[PDB]
Structure formats: C-alpha cells, structure tokens
Design a protein around this ligand. Structure first.
Ligand SMILES: CC(C)(COP(=O)(O)OP(=O)(O)OC[C@H]1O[C@@H](n2cnc3c(N)ncnc32)[C@H](O)[C@@H]1OP(=O)(O)O)[C@@H](O)C(=O)NCCC(=O)NCCS
Ligand SMILES: CC(C)(COP(=O)(O)OP(=O)(O)OC[C@H]1O[C@@H](n2cnc3c(N)ncnc32)[C@H](O)[C@@H]1OP(=O)(O)O)[C@@H](O)C(=O)NCCC(=O)NCCS
Ligand SMILES: CC(C)(COP(=O)(O)OP(=O)(O)OC[C@H]1O[C@@H](n2cnc3c(N)ncnc32)[C@H](O)[C@@H]1OP(=O)(O)O)[C@@H](O)C(=O)NCCC(=O)NCCS
Ligand SMILES: CC(C)(COP(=O)(O)OP(=O)(O)OC[C@H]1O[C@@H](n2cnc3c(N)ncnc32)[C@H](O)[C@@H]1OP(=O)(O)O)[C@@H](O)C(=O)NCCC(=O)NCCS
Ligand SMILES: CC(C)(COP(=O)(O)OP(=O)(O)OC[C@H]1O[C@@H](n2cnc3c(N)ncnc32)[C@H](O)[C@@H]1OP(=O)(O)O)[C@@H](O)C(=O)NCCC(=O)NCCS
Ligand SMILES: CC(C)(COP(=O)(O)OP(=O)(O)OC[C@H]1O[C@@H](n2cnc3c(N)ncnc32)[C@H](O)[C@@H]1OP(=O)(O)O)[C@@H](O)C(=O)NCCC(=O)NCCS
Lengths: 240, 240, 240, 244, 244, 244
C-alpha cells in the first residue's frame, strides 16, 4: 500500500528524467536517489520549509526525528497521495503531489507541527504554522486533529482552528474556513467527519458537526449541523 | 498598438528613475535598457519564476524560445497591459502591470506554460503551473485556453481548470474559481465568453457558459448558464 | 501602554530562548537585543520586505526614517498587538504578532507605504504595496486610511481600495474585500467605522458605510449601508 | 587559427557534455543548462560568466546582457577564449577535457572576465570595469587591472593570488601559475609594469617587477623575483633572478 | 589511535559547545545546529561540509547525502578527520579548542572535502570529484587534485594558496602553511609530484617541485624552492633549497 | 589629523558618488544606498561591512548592529578607517578616488573587519571575534588574528594571502602587499610575531618570521624571508634577507 505507492513514484521519475533534462537532476535528488517515501518527504519538506532562520538541512533533522518517533505520519502521507490522484483527474501521477502540490506540502508540514505541539515544543510549531501560512497560504493550527487520505486541492486560502477536527478521507478546496463563531472560549471549531467533501469558499463556523459522506457546496456558510450522507448549501446553509 | 505601449513604458521609466533613485537601476535593468516588450517581459518573467531548481538565466532562454516560436504572446501581453490601465483606475501607468502586478505576471507565465503544454513538454508546464501557484496565488491549469486583453485584478486566489475557456477582454478578480462540479470526467469547466466581468469570490462551476458583455457579481455561485449581456448574482446565481 | 507591551515582549523572549534553542538566536536578534518596539519593528519589517531589489539593510533605513518623522506609527503598532492578543484566543503572547503574523506584518508595512504616499514618494509605495501583496497576500492600497487597534486575523486574501477608510479597533478576517462597485470614478470605497468586526469572505462594495460596533457575517456581500451597532449578512446583506 | 578553434572546441565540448550528462545524474541539468542547450561557445561563455560574476548588486540575468553586448561588439574575445581553452587542454596534464576550463577553472573565468572589463575600460565605462575587477578578485582571487593588455592562448592554472598591474603586457601563449605578480618596483609612476612576450612560462610565486621585458619563450623559475630584463629563450631563476 | 580520537575529540567538542552557546547568544543556534544536536563527529562533519560546499548547482541537503554515503562506505575518513582536528589543536598555538577547526578553519574543511573527492575519484565518479575540487578552490582557496594521496593528522593552517598535484603524496602528521605548492617541474608527465613523508613541516610559500622525496621529520623553510630530495630529520631552505 | 580626515574624506566620497551615479545607471542605486543616503563615513562603513560580512549564520542587518555598537563605543576606529582610505588614495597609483577603497577593495574591508574583531576580542567576546576572523579569511583571503595590534594609515592592496599572527604589531603608515606573512619561526610560543614600525613598505610575498623588529621607514623586498631585525631606513631583501 505504501511500498506500492513508492514504487510507482520511482517509476514515474525515471521516465520524467528521460523526457525533461532541465529537471532530471531535480527528479534525481528529490526522488530517484531515495529508498522510500520517508526519505523523499523529509527532503521535500526541508526544502519547502527552508528559511534564513532555519535552512533545509536543519529542518530535515526535525522531520526525520518526527518520522522516527511516529512512522505512521509516512503512511498518512501515502494515503493523502493516493487520495489526490484518484480524486483529482488533472492529477495523473503519484509523484505530482509530492513534487508540486502546495496543499499536500502544507498538509504534511502540519503533521510535523502536530507532532511538535503534542510533545510540548510549542514555540517551534507556531514558527512552522506561520511558515506554511506565508509559503503556501494554508493556516492550520497544529493543535487541530487531522486524519489520513485527505486532499487539499488548489489549497490557496484554507484556515483551520485550534479545536477543529477532520477525519479520514475528507476533501477540502480553496478558501475553506473551519472557524469559530463569536464569544465561546474553550471548544469552538467544526468536527468534520469521514468521507466529507467541502467546496470552494466554504465558510463553516462554530463547534458544530458535519457527519459522514456529506457535501458542502461552494460559497456555503454552515452554522447548523449536517447529518450523515446529506448535502448543505447557500448562505446560511440549509439541506437540498 | 504595441510599439506604442512600449514607447510609453520607456517614457514612464525615464521619469520614474529620475524621482526614485533607490529603484533607478531596477527601472534601468527591467525596462530602460530593453529595445522592446518581448525583451522586458522575458527579463521580468525570468525573475518572477526564478527558483533554486531553475534560476532566472535558464528560464529566460525558455521564454525567449516561446516568444520566438509564437510572437503573438507578446501582442497578447500588450493588450493585457492596455486592459488593466484603462479598467483599473488605481493603475495610472502602463509600466505598472509589467513591473508589479502579480495577476499580470501569473497571466503571462500561464502563456508560457500553455505553449509548453501544447508542444508536449508537459512535465515542465506542471512545474511552472505550481511555481506560479506558490509565487502568485494563481492556479491556472496550462491546458486551459485564455485570450487577449484580459485583466486579473488583485489576483490573490484565482483557480481555473484544464478544460476551461476565457476569451478576449474578460476581467476577473480575487478568489474567482472557474471550476468543476462533481463526477463528469472529460469536459467539465466554464466557457467564459468575450467582454465578461467576474467579481470577487465568484465561484462558477461545471461545463456551462457565460455569454458576451455579462456580469457576475461578487460572492456569486454560478451553476446555470448566463445569456449574452445579462447579469447574474447570489447563491446560486439567478438573473437580476 | 507601549513601554508595557514591550516589557512583556522582552520577557516572553527570554523564556522562549530558554526552551527552544533552535530559535534562541532568532529571538535574540529580533527582540532581546533591542531597547524598544521601534527597533524590533524596523528589524522585523526590513526582513519581511527584503528582496534582491532592496535588501533588509536598505529597507530598515526607510522604516527608521518614517518612525523618526512619525513616532505614532509605533504606538499604532503597539495597539494592533494588544488587539490581536485579546481578540484572538489562539494568540496567548504579545510577541507572536510581531514575530509571526502576516496580517500584522502587512498592516505595519502599509503604514510605511502610507507615510511614503503622503510625502510624495509614490513610486516606492507602489513597489512596497505589491511586495506585501506577493509576500503576505494582503493588497492594501497605501492611499487608503487605516487607524489603530486593528486586527487582520489569518489575513490571506485581504484587499482594500485607494479611497477606503478603516477606523480604530476594527477586526478583519481572511478574503475580505473593501472594494469598488462599477463605474463611479472619484470616491468609491467603504468607510468602515470604529469597533466593527468583518467576517471571512466578506465582500463589501461601493462608497457606502458600516457604522460603529457592527457585525458583517462570513460570506456577506454588502451593497447597502449598515447603521451603528447593527448586524448584516447574506448575499446581498440585509439586517438580522 | 582562432576562428577555426571556435568550432573545434565547441564541437568537443558538446560531445563531452552528452557523455557527462549520462554518467553523472546529479549534474545532468547543470551540464544541460550551461552547455547542451547552446549552439556556440559564446552563448555558453556568457551563460557561465553571468553566473560566476553574479551578486546582489548585479544578478546573472543583468550581467549576461553586458557580456552579450561586448561579444556582439567584439567577437574576437570569444575566439581568444577558444584559444585559452585550447591552451589549458594541451598544456595542463591534469586537464583532459575541453569543458573543464569552461565549467570549473577559476583562472579561465577570471581571464574572460578581465576581457569584458577591458572592453568596458576602453569604452570609457570605468566605474563598471572597477566593480568587475574587484568582484573577480573576491570571487576568484585573481586581480587584473582592466587597462592591462593580455592576449590569447593564456593558461592561468591554478590561478590563486595572481596580480597584474595597469600597464602590464602579456602576449599570446603565456602560461602563468599561482601567486604570479606582474607589478611595480614601488619607485615609478606611469609605465611601470612588465612586458611578457609570447610563449613565456612563469612559475609559481614569481614576482616580476618594473617596466622590464621578458623575451619570447623564456622561463621564469618558481619563487623568482625578476628585476632585470630576461632575454628570449632563456631561464631566469633566483631571488633576485639571474640567467641560469 | 584514530578510533580512540574519534571519541576523545567529540567529547571535547560537545563540552565546548555548551559553554560557547551560553557565552555567545548570537551564535547559540549555530552551535546547536552544527554541534549540540549531533551524537558523533561524523554527523557534525557531514553537516559542516554540506553547508560549506553548498551552491545553486548543488545545495547542502543534497551534498550531505553524498558525504554520508562516503562516511558509511569508508568511516576511516571520519577517524582521519579526528586526527586532523587533534593535530590542529596541539600544533597551532592560536587554537585552544577542538571545535575551532570543525567550525571555522578553511584548511580543515578543504582537507575533509578533498577526502570526499578522493573517495569519489576511486569509485570512478570523476565528474563529481572535479566539480568539488574546483568548488573547494573557489570557496576555500585550496586546490587539491582528488587523485592525490593524503593521510591524517594533517594541519593546513592558514590554508590560502595551497596547491597539491595529482601524483603527490603527503603522509601522516605533516604541517603545511599558506602558499605551499606540491607540484611539477614543467618537464615531465605521469609521476611528477613530490612525496612528503611523515612529520614534515613545510613553511609558508614553499614550492616543492618534481617527483622528489622529503624524508620524515624534515623541515622546509618558508620561501623555499625545493628541487632535490631532502633527507630525513633535515632542514632545507633557500631558493633553490640547500640542506642547512 | 585623523578627525580632520573624517570630514575631508567623506566630503570627497560624497562628491564622487554623485558623479558616479550619473555616469553608470546600473550601479546608481548601489552608489545611492551605500554612499549618498549617508551623512558620515561611519554610517557608510557599517553599511559596507554589514553586506561584506553577511552570511546565513549572521545576516547584514544583524552585523550592522554589532558594527554600530563598536563605532559608538570607540569612534577612533572610524578615524583610522579615514586614514586608511587616505593612505590608499595617495599611495596606490591605480586608485584615483576615495570611494574605491570603501566600495571595492577587499584589503580595506578586511582591515576594518579586523578592527571590529579586535574591539570584540578586548571586550572578551572572543567566540564572535573568531567567527569574524575566519569569515574574513574566506570572503577576502586575509587572515588577521583579532589580538594583533594594527594602527592606521594602513594600505593592504591587493590583499590576497596576507597572514598576521596573534602577537604581531603593525604601526601607522605601513604598506603591505599580497602574500605577506607576519608569523612565527615554529620554535617559540607566547611573544613570537614581528613588530613592524611605521612607514614600512613590505613587498609582495615577504615572510617576516619571529618576534623581530622592522624599524621605521624600512623597505622589505618582495620575496624576502626576514629572520633578523631590520634597522630603520634600511632595505632588506633576499632569502634569507640581508641589508642591501
Ligand atoms: C452542491 C454540490 C456539492 C453537489 O451536490 P448534490 O448533492 O449533487 O446537489 P445537486 O447538484 O443535485 O443540486 C441540488 C440543488 O442544490 C443546488 N446547489 C448546487 N450547488 C449549490 C451551491 N454551491 N450553493 C447553493 N446551491 C447549490 C442546485 O441548484 C439544486 O437546486 P434546485 O433543486 O433548487 O434547482 C455541487 O453543486 C458543488 O457545489 N460542488 C463544489 C465543488 C467545488 O468546490 N468546485 C470548485 C472547483 S476546484
Ligand atoms: C452585480 C454588479 C456586477 C453590478 O451589476 P448591475 O448589472 O449594475 O446590477 P445593479 O447594481 O443594478 O443591481 C441590481 C440588483 O442586483 C443586486 N446585486 C448587485 N450586486 C450583487 C451581488 N454581488 N450579489 C447579489 N446581488 C447583487 C442589487 O442589490 C439589486 O437588487 P434589487 O434590485 O433586488 O434591490 C455589482 O454589484 C458587483 O457585484 N460588482 C463586483 C465588483 C467586484 O468584484 N469588486 C471587488 C473590489 S476589487
Ligand atoms: C453573524 C455573526 C457575526 C454573529 O452575529 P449575531 O449578531 O450574533 O447574529 P446571530 O448569531 O444571533 O444570528 C442571527 C441570525 O443571523 C443568521 N446568521 C448568522 N451568521 C450568518 C452569516 N454569516 N450569513 C448569513 N446569516 C447568518 C443566523 O442563522 C440567525 O438566523 P435566523 O434568526 O433566521 O435563524 C456570526 O454568525 C459570524 O458570521 N461570524 C463570523 C466570524 C468569522 O468570520 N469566522 C471565521 C473563522 S476565523
Ligand atoms: C626553472 C624551471 C622552469 C626549469 O628551467 P630549466 O631551464 O629547465 O632549468 P634547469 O632545471 O636546467 O636548472 C638550471 C639551474 O637553475 C636552478 N633552478 C631551477 N629552477 C629553479 C628555481 N625555480 N629557482 C632557483 N633556481 C632554480 C637549478 O638548480 C640549476 O642550477 P645548477 O646549474 O647550479 O645545477 C623549473 O625549475 C621551475 O621553476 N618550474 C616551475 C614550475 C611551477 O612553478 N609550478 C608547477 C606546480 S603548480
Ligand atoms: C627553517 C625553519 C623551519 C627553522 O629550521 P632550523 O632547522 O631551526 O634552522 P635554523 O633556524 O637553525 O637556521 C639555520 C640556517 O638556515 C637559515 N634559515 C632559516 N630559515 C630559513 C628560511 N626560511 N629561508 C632561508 N634560510 C633560512 C638561517 O639563517 C641559518 O643560517 P646560518 O647557519 O647561515 O646562520 C624556519 O626558519 C622557518 O622557515 N619557519 C617557517 C615558519 C612559517 O613558514 N610560517 C609561520 C607563519 S604563518
Ligand atoms: C627592495 C625594493 C623595495 C627596492 O628597494 P631599494 O632600497 O630601492 O633597492 P635597490 O633597487 O637599490 O636595490 C638594491 C639591491 O638589492 C637588490 N634587490 C632589490 N629588490 C630586491 C628583492 N625584492 N629581492 C632581492 N634583491 C633585491 C638589487 O638587485 C640591488 O642589488 P645590487 O646592489 O647587488 O645591484 C624593490 O626592489 C621591491 O622589492 N619592491 C617590491 C614591490 C612589490 O612588492 N610589489 C608591487 C607589485 S603588486
């Protein structure tokens, strides 16, 4: 499931190097000279999170440290790759999210932040949170809880709050907010449940819920819970 | 029409250098020491698309190669400059889009991607597509088809799909999606027609159409076609 | 009020350095080795606005020049820090906006642009305007007029026009447009008044007004004025 | 001749590049961008100088324009470069490829950079010539005043420490090693620097001082301090140098 | 021995690092990233070489893989480095910390960079060895052909201008100063560079030319041009050098 | 005097800058940012050092604070710099503008960088002084231990290869060329480096070894190895040097 995603990635690379020599050595460094996904992702993230304050080479040690202490972060990433390839038809390659998709990079960055937050290294997770915000336009609070098989497609704009929850197999799109409402300190953010699909510009406020296999439509503002397998829409959101 | 836009640009530059000496040599390098627009644009794009993987100097050869094989990309750009200057009143100078406007830079980048896609160099057009996505927050699939006299104003957020079409003299604004809907592989993206104007946060889904001289209002979600010279609005969109 | 914000910032720093040694010398350079906020902000902005065309060290002289000729820009910034800390609960530290929040950085950048615009150095303010647009996804025209105690939370997407006005103690959020409407050259942009709160994706068009203690809801398009202490919503906006 | 070298050299570099790309994948794109995507030496050289001279003050993209202006105005600079490449290939036993100077050797780069600066100097663009001379000094540790007159088929391996003064002459086919100084006594102004004639070999650490001539085909011993003229086809060595 | 040095040195560097971090807050994160976050010298060395050899063509992250591959394949390179560090500490009176070579001294960096290039050269990855040799030349002003054979406990302070040819030998415990040339006469090909035996001290500016031997424990005077063999436990000085 | 030089020099640099900006548009903003936007030499010098010493570990913006702290604490460093500029202008026949040292010459930059490091060294901030010394070595190829005592009106053209040891003294108005070594014999510790008195001219490649004195107004021949004291107003040349 993993080793199988990787094998594919390596294959695509070999063929990609053969037909675009301007990026050959990019493909070779990022993919072809790694043994597994853990390696390629560490390399990729290090470059994506690089700054004057922390160069790639120092970030890589942190990502490797996280992946060593929680190997499942690599499995989650594999599922997030499988996801975007089947769900996005414009994506016709496993390598593509790993190489190029800022939603994917932002997502995996978040997991690093999540691991750091939970260990107690909060100061650094906040630096990383805002790094990803400026680099990739995705502002996920690392205290948030996010599962596997997730897709953030065209991700420019996404925001997700401290107490929020997203569960396996969700698909989000641009400008999607999983926000607060007004006043209620403590818990205050959505609990998006399995297999959901949120559309463009979808604001979704308060400590509510969106149950299984649902559908938020583009433009929607969602103040009221959505039951399993339903479909909400409009401003505010009401079932259709 | 072209030579006339350029002449203006050069003039503005001379006066800009004279009254802001901190940017004089910027103006001199970007504009004043070029003979024509082709040159200035190649320079400008090279810098805008620069990365560790491909520095300005290597990108410039690709843009020059494209402009040599299709000189009309330069004419399109001239019309996209004329456009933004007359349509945006905050823009009081021809040089401004060329120098500073990320919608303009993103647009011209797309044309390079479009030329590469069509020639068969898909691997590189995808790298460029996502480059522009991270650099400028505009995610235009290069297989899309876009015409001349276009304005992308304040462009932070724009997304446009593989099968989409935009035609001469359109004006788009921030957060505008020309997206898909749900399920229908093959053709699935809007055909925006001549002289249209799309407003802020305008989601527009499916393989529909928006005819001539139309008007999408800010916030609109557009599932249903709009006839020529009409005006849609709201969630969903209905004529007013 | 100021000296008190600073004292806090310095304290947080000392403790932050002690528990995250990877950023110690970052904290030390940005904060701990400054005497006051003016200094720390000059340092911070210089780094944030740095480009090949203008490195940090040359930008810092401009920011210092502005802060010398208008010391109140520092007081405004202090109030914008106090603001975000009390209003955002995820923010539990005074240092955080100064260090990390792109809405805050963008805001203070704008003030520099505003000072330059008003002095007559328009060419440079436009360079800075678009710098901030690409760096931080906030596109505030510098001719706009913005007061103190402002918060731009998760700011990815904000746009604000030439003739616009925002007054003390406002809170804006992502994707918020304070835009024009159609045709009316001269004055054409909102006058947001004291203590207002604008929500996610809130488009707000024309030379209208939003009076005191108001509330624009997420997703709202606002064509019609809002009286003091009201609350608007939906597409278009009508009181509730 | 120089113009025939233009093509024999480029031909060879291109071939080398294909084989290099196949055998070293980490550099494949480097070899492609610098060499394989170009159709002549001039285009590769401008590419290479631009990256090598790049700085925050003046980036590659901008330097390339300057370098290409100069090549258009005086394409003998490219033919000289061809001869300089040929010189390194045949004379330095450690260099077995034509590409090596062009890609790697700082002496070769400094040498071609001096050519751009000399062209600028004679066009009256002295402010820029001085900027580039000192850039070259810092980046490659070769210091050549742009008013110096230097010919072709020059080998500057391994160039670290070379200093060449304003009024020095170096003619075709000279080989200079590290730490050569072509300078003044300290006593005069105006014409005060040596005149090195052709085919001269100058050994490491040699200091040649004054407006003195070193005649064709002579050899200067490593470590020498040469204060008097050196006849043609002669070896001078010592501190100060005697004819040996 | 080398393997015991691996640990005695690292132990000391770590201690030094804690004290350095406390006393200089502007560098605290530098010391933390380079030294304190690592558990052995090898891991610190790869970190340090990667940053030092980094370029647009090949960034730190990528070089580290190469360096770590080489260390896995031949960990004696790390033990040599340990000895080289020890050498600098005990021999250069201006160096009072083990960390100083590792952090700062370009001679030490060039030396360990040559080791990576030599390993690559003997694996047949010559294109990359040449890229790195010339990188080292530009960044640190030391030029060592990767086919040279160099041992351990080598001090290259203060290394600017050192040139070492393809067929040179430098054995353990040699001390070389600035502007040393280990080169050819100009007359031969093939085996043509000096053989420096152990414990030899070579003074600044010395040129040692030809396939000649300098015997164990000898001393070469600054400024010397050595053309003839130098017996063990002997001092040679002059231009050309005589046994003094 | 030094303080009068502060103003006569700056006056001239500003004038030069206006004329340079007008005649070379590619550098106009460079000249504006470095020179025209400043009101005194100190402010320009800190600007220039900060860019020149910048690195990933420590960027311009941060170095400028350090440099400005030092200038506030001891403004004689700026007056020395003024004298050093004046020295280059009058003594190097190739330099015809006051701006040239400040903008371009690495010897001048290394020299002022040593001043910052020396100030740090005497304040007990040695970790940072060593970081900067070795930065200076790599960037400008001048190696000056920060404990060295160096005065003013010093010309270090064209500085590549200069090495100056911990216990060396160089007094006012000394002129040093490339590849000068002010070092030890190898035999002693503690006080072991030369004492160069004022107005001394040291020629290229000279090695001056031991705690020996070179007396005021003497001249050291290029290539020399000086092992014995040199009386005032005397010329020493040779390997080893004799009074000539
Ligand atoms: C709502 C959506 C998810 C499909 O849900 P569905 O369960 O198939 O619903 P249907 O398409 O059958 O639509 C049913 C009703 O809801 C309406 N509707 C559909 N999408 C809507 C939206 N975004 N907002 C408001 N109403 C909507 C339809 O017009 C129809 O109304 P009617 O019955 O009164 O005429 C889909 O329309 C959508 O919005 N997808 C978003 C994908 C996206 O974000 N794309 C961006 C491009 S990358
Ligand atoms: C719709 C728009 C394009 C103007 O169209 P128009 O053909 O002139 O329509 P009108 O202004 O006459 O408005 C007609 C009706 O539509 C409504 N309407 C206008 N804009 C609307 C919007 N964005 N959403 C929903 N309804 C809207 C009006 O309130 C009016 O309603 P009523 O007759 O029931 O009272 C304009 O209002 C708009 O939205 N422009 C967007 C520009 C933008 O994106 N600016 C961002 C700043 S950079
Ligand atoms: C509107 C808002 C500001 C609260 O205002 P309020 O004065 O407390 O109004 P209430 O919550 O009492 O809601 C009153 C009515 O307006 C409706 N309403 C609330 N928010 C709305 C929105 N964004 N759009 C449309 N209608 C909305 C409610 O459903 C209710 O309708 P009903 O009475 O017909 O059932 C709040 O709902 C909101 O939108 N906050 C935005 C915060 C944000 O942008 N968060 C992003 C996360 S960082
Ligand atoms: C001078 C040199 C070129 C040889 O020239 P040559 O004409 O072949 O001279 P010969 O070898 O016959 O030597 C002639 C005499 O000069 C002496 N001599 C040779 N080279 C000398 C030098 N560099 N300095 C001083 N004396 C030297 C010899 O000892 C001999 O003296 P003798 O007649 O008293 O025995 C060679 O010795 C040399 O200096 N090569 C420099 C190579 C170099 O700089 N670097 C390559 C390494 S990167
Ligand atoms: C050669 C050297 C190592 C000393 O070796 P030694 O065996 O102790 O020699 P001595 O000092 O006894 O000197 C012996 C003779 O050689 C001469 N001599 C010493 N060093 C010499 C040199 N470098 N060049 C020429 N002659 C030299 C002495 O004048 C003396 O001559 P004499 O017998 O006619 O009086 C030392 O002089 C030297 O050259 N050190 C180099 C240090 C250096 O390069 N740099 C450190 C600064 S970064
Ligand atoms: C030594 C020097 C400064 C001249 O000093 P001077 O007092 O004018 O000496 P003179 O020229 O009268 O020469 C005196 C004797 O010393 C010899 N001599 C001069 N310079 C010498 C040197 N560098 N090495 C060895 N011998 C030298 C002369 O051959 C002469 O010998 P003689 O009496 O047997 O004929 C000059 O020759 C010199 O070395 N200048 C260095 C310039 C430099 O390093 N670089 C500039 C280029 S970047």
């Amino acid at each position: 499931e993993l080793e199988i995603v990787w094998k594919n990635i390596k294959a695509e690379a070999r063929a990609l190097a053969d037909c675009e020599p301007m990026l050959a050595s990019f493909y070779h460094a990022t993919l072809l000279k790694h043994e597994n996904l853990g390696s390629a992702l560490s390399y990729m993230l290090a470059n994506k999170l690089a700054s004057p304050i922390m160069p790639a080479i120092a970030i890589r040690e942190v990502v490797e440290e996280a992946y060593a202490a929680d190997p499942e972060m690599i499995a989650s990433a594999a599922c997030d790759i499988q996801a975007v390839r089947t769900r996005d038809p414009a994506v016709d390659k496993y390598s593509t999210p790993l190489l190029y998709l800022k939603g994917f990079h932002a997502l995996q960055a978040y997991r690093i932040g999540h691991w750091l937050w939970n260990k107690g290294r909060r100061a650094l997770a906040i630096f990383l949170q805002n790094q990803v915000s400026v680099s990739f336009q995705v502002d996920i609070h690392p205290a948030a809880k996010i599962g596997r098989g997730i897709m953030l497609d065209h991700a420019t704009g996404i925001v997700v709050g401290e107490t929020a929850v997203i569960e396996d197999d969700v698909s989000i799109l641009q400008s999607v907010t999983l926000g607060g409402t007004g006043k209620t300190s403590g818990d205050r953010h959505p609990k998006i449940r399995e297999g959901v699909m949120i559309g463009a510009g979808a604001k979704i406020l308060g400590n509510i819920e969106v149950g299984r296999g649902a559908k938020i439509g583009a433009g929607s503002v969602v103040l009221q819970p959505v039951p399993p397998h339903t479909t909400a829409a409009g401003v505010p959101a009401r079932i259709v």
